Every structure is written in structure tokens, then in C-alpha cells.
Design a protein around this ligand. Structure first.
Ligand code: THG
Ligand code: THG
Lengths: 267, 267
């Protein structure tokens, strides 16, 4: 069954930016609870503030989220020092978003989780940036798994993100995401492949439609977890329909339950 | 690449049945036109009336469609004798819906199109519609073999694996994809086709399920489908899925359609 990382608590979204500035606890609790109620397995928290305010902002977001829901945190920062300084504010282990072959991300994050039950998203990039092909992404995923192994981190705890690019930039963006996913899972059947949805549609109209269909496909290609907006009813219906279509919803009960509970459908 | 057989002109849709009984040509003319304008490659025509009226009703439908559009006909009848009696009324080669190993379907239809027409061939026989993969694959081989008897090339045939309701078999889509893989493997030049609505029988939000089934079936290798191209949401899925599969250079059909208002909010 697809693992859902709810994306909505970010500093990039203007309403969330404004709620952080205001210390608007109600808005953050409501995003937390409703993402959980829609089926999120992790609640992403991303401060998106300046460097010097990031750690305090993450701490505030984690405190408020955990008041509202027991669903575990996905700590989203591009600064491993920030992640280090907030890990202890989590009440239970969750997901770290993320590491990569860039700079010292692995050597800061992996000692911090080596021994505990934290999981980790690992992006397929390194110091030269986004890879320019499938093969490069696959080799980077291998290098990530080996590094993780040297700190005793099992492949099961790892969500490889092959950083899908925009379909407007490369019309093979999905055919290349599906190929990297097949090769990575072929080399590591216990590993998890993850993606965000939004990058795929950057540069196109009706981005929600494009995101949905990419999800519908990415699931069929083997994607195990995804960062997405589970408050998007249409997206949630497509998600659950795709779960039933891939033979993961016994007697289509979850889909039927979601409609009867008015989780999906009009409206 | 997905070849669209517009399903609208049927004798089972209450409104079209009333148009046949009322001889309301305008309605049929506008379904032919709108389905062509939406991109249909073939216009399915199905009488769905008392047997002894079927030939005359098929002829009436074929004349009105033809007068309106050059988009070729898909003659839809469960009675091969009816097909035989109306074939000469088509102004140009189209598609015949359908043959199967049931009764004398092949023995009637194949000599009819030998030396000429494309054909949908269902994977069912005198015992009914098998639900398993292996039986359907074997039935398809038998059909391709019998079609070869009349010099009908693989390229002219659209194999329909008759996908059943997901609520009746949760593996229906998985089985579709596997049948498709095997059939194509054996016959790389053939077409695989499906309708979209059977899959969602017995589930709520049928249109949602149908649209995700379409996306999945396209990635699985479906070549043609009988569907409603007047459905704004289904067309937006279809076109987003064409772009995601690498088939819409620069995403130009998707953008063009959006610009023309074809897909997206009706503003
Ligand atoms: N590891 C990893 N982490 C990530 C991303 C990834 O790729 N991989 N990409 C981002 C995923 N997070 C978001 C958060 C919000 C939006 C966003 O745009 N939200 C709108 C859009 C609404 C919608 O489409 O439903 C909103 O209004 O809430 C997109 C990605 C950042 N974190
Ligand atoms: N070879 C083959 N032929 C077939 C089918 C198939 O499987 N395979 N199945 C049927 C396909 N034709 C239709 C026509 C109309 C509808 C239908 O239900 N239409 C609604 C709703 C349209 C919509 O959902 O957008 C309407 O109001 O027009 C469903 C299947 C019969 N012909």
C-alpha cells in the first residue's frame, strides 16, 4: 500500500509562511490533523525560512504538529545541522528528509540515526548536481545504500528519491523515472522508492491533472512512498482507485469506505 | 498513439435509444460530429434494438454519421449476419466490432473482410468469458491463426481481453496487463483494445475508476479503446497520459487542447 508523506506544512506556501510569522497554532494543527485523517503516514514539516531562523521554526512546527496528531514527523530540511539540532524534539521516530551524496549529508545524518528506528529519504544527486541520466541515478543509489550499510542502516529504512524532472524539460521524465525505479528495486528488492509529484508538471497547464496521472503511473512502476497533498480530494480518489486497480484493496473495501465516509467524491 | 473508438452512438444509452425510436437525426449527427472533433478515430454505431430491426437501424445510423463525418465507422453488433448485411453501406473501410470464437463469428466475418477492414476479436468462446490469463491468451492465438487463414494481417486485429469488473476480480487490471504482455509478445504487430466501463461495475465513482484504469492500461500497452471522448475529465487524463508516456512532443497537444478550452474548466 503506498506510504503517504503529507506535504502541506511548508514555508514555501504563502499561508504557511504567514502562520509561522504569526505563530498561528490553529492553522498548523488543522493541516496536521486533516492530513492524518486523509491517510498520511508521515507529516512533512519544512520551515523554508532564513538559515538563522530554521531550527527554531522547525521546533515550533514539530511541537504544534505533535499536539495534534500521533502520525510521525518527516523533518524536511536541506541543512543536516538543522536536522541534528531538532531530532530530539520528536516524540517518536519518523522520517528524515533528506540525505544525498552531496557534501557531508550522509556523514552528519547517518551517525545520528545509526542505532535508532528513524528512516531516511536519500536523493540521487551528488556534488555535481542532478544527474543527467538513468545510469547515474542508479549508481548513486548503490553508493547511498553502501554508505548506509557502513552505519548499519538496513535498506528497508531507506527511501530512494530519483528526483524526477519536469516533463516539459524532458518528455521522457516519467519513462526515465520508471526505469530507474525498476533498476533500483531490481538491485535492492527491500529498498523503497519515493517521489514528490509536483516537479513533473512544472511548465505545463492543469498541473493537478498532470500530477495525478503521474502518480497513477508511478504507482504502477513500483513507487513505494510519495510526498503529496492528501487534502486534494481528486488526487486522493485517484490514489485509492489506483490502490484498488493494483490489487491492493481487498474487495475494494477501502475505496468503498472512503466514498461512504465522504472522503472522496462530490464534494 | 492511443486509437480512440467513440462509444456514444449506442442502442443501450437511453437518450440514443429514444433518438432511434424518434428518428431524431440531429442528435446522431451531433454525436458523430462532437466525437470526431474530440479526436475519435472511429465512430462506433450499435443499434441495440429488436433483432428484426437491427439491419435497418444500423443502416440508418451509418448514413447519418457518414453524411456528417469522414471519420470511419466501427460497426458494433453481436450478430455477424447483421454486419454482413450492412458492410456494403460503409463509404470507406473502418472496423468491425466484433468476432470471437463463439458460434460461427469467424466463419461469417473473416471471408467478409478477406482482401479488403480491421476487426476487434474478443477473447471468449462457446463456454463464455474466461477470467484467467492463460485461457484468454490461448483464445487470442486461435483467432490470430484463423484470421491468418484468410490473409488478415496481425496489424488489422484489435484483441479485446474482455476485462471484468474489479469488484468481481481485484486482479482484473493486473491480469489485463499480463495478458497484453503475452499477446503482444507473440504478435508484436497486433493491437490490444478494451472498453473502459466494465472495470468499474459495482464500485462507486465509476468515472474515476475508469480514468485510472485507462491510464494504467495505456502504460501496460493498450493500443486502442472504446470510450467517451466527450468526457472533459477523461480526455484531460488521456492527453496527460499521452504526454507522460513520451508520445506528445513538447507536450504540444496537451497545451494546445488547454488553450482551446477542450480540456480543463469550461470557462
Ligand atoms: N524528498 C523530497 N522532498 C520534497 C520534495 C521532493 O520532491 N522530494 N518536493 C517538495 C514536496 N513538498 C511540497 C509542498 C507543497 C507543494 C505545493 O505546491 N503545494 C500546493 C499545491 C496544491 C496541490 O497541488 O494539491 C498547496 O497549495 O498546498 C509541493 C510540494 C519539498 N520536499
Ligand atoms: N469491443 C467492445 N465493444 C463494446 C464494449 C467493450 O467492452 N468491447 N462495451 C460497450 C462499449 N460501449 C459503451 C457505450 C456507452 C457506455 C456508457 O455507459 N456511456 C454513458 C456514460 C459516459 C461516460 O462515462 O463518460 C453515456 O451516457 O454515454 C459504455 C460503453 C459495448 N461495445
Amino acid at each position: 500500500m503506498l506510504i503517504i508523506i503529507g506535504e502541506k506544512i511548508n514555508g514555501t506556501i504563502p499561508s504557511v509562511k504567514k502562520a509561522i510569522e504569526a505563530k498561528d497554532e490553529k492553522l498548523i494543527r488543522d493541516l496536521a490533523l486533516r492530513q492524518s485523517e486523509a491517510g498520511a503516514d508521515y507529516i512533512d514539516v519544512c520551515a523554508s525560512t532564513s538559515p538563522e531562523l530554521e531550527v527554531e521554526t522547525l521546533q515550533w512546527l514539530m511541537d504544534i504538529v505533535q499536539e495534534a496528531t500521533d502520525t510521525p514527523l518527516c523533518i524536511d530540511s536541506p541543512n543536516p545541522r538543522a536536522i541534528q539540532q531538532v531530532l530530539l524534539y520528536a516524540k517518536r521516530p519518523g522520517l528524515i528528509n533528506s540525505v544525498s551524496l552531496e557534501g557531508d549529508k550522509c556523514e552528519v545524518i547517518f551517525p545520528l540515526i545509526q542505532g535508532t528506528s528513524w528512516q531516511v529519504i536519500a536523493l540521487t544527486c551528488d556534488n555535481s548536481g542532478i544527474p543527467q541520466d538513468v545510469q547515474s541515478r542508479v549508481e548513486i543509489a548503490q553508493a547511498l545504500v553502501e554508505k548506509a550499510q557502513s552505519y548499519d542502516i538496513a535498506q528497508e529504512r531507506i527511501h530512494i528519491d530519483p528526483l524526477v524532472i519536469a516533463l516539459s524539460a524532458d518528455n521522457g521524465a516519467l519513462l526515465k523515472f520508471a526505469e530507474a525505479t525498476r533498476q533500483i528495486k531490481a538491485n535492492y528488492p527491500m529498498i523503497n522508492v519515493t517521489s514528490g509529484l509536483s516537479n513533473i508538471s512544472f511548465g505545463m497547464p492543469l498541473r493537478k491533472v498532470v500530477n495525478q496521472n503521474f502518480l497513477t503511473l508511478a504507482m504502477f512502476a513500483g513507487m513505494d512512498s510519495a510526498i503529496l497533498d492528501p487534502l486534494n480530494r481528486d488526487l486522493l480518489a485517484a490514489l485509492l482507485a489506483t490502490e484498488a486497480l493494483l490489487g491492493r484493496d481487498k474487495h475494494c473495501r477501502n475505496f468503498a469506505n472512503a466514498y461512504r465516509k465522504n472522503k472522496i467524491g462530490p464534494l
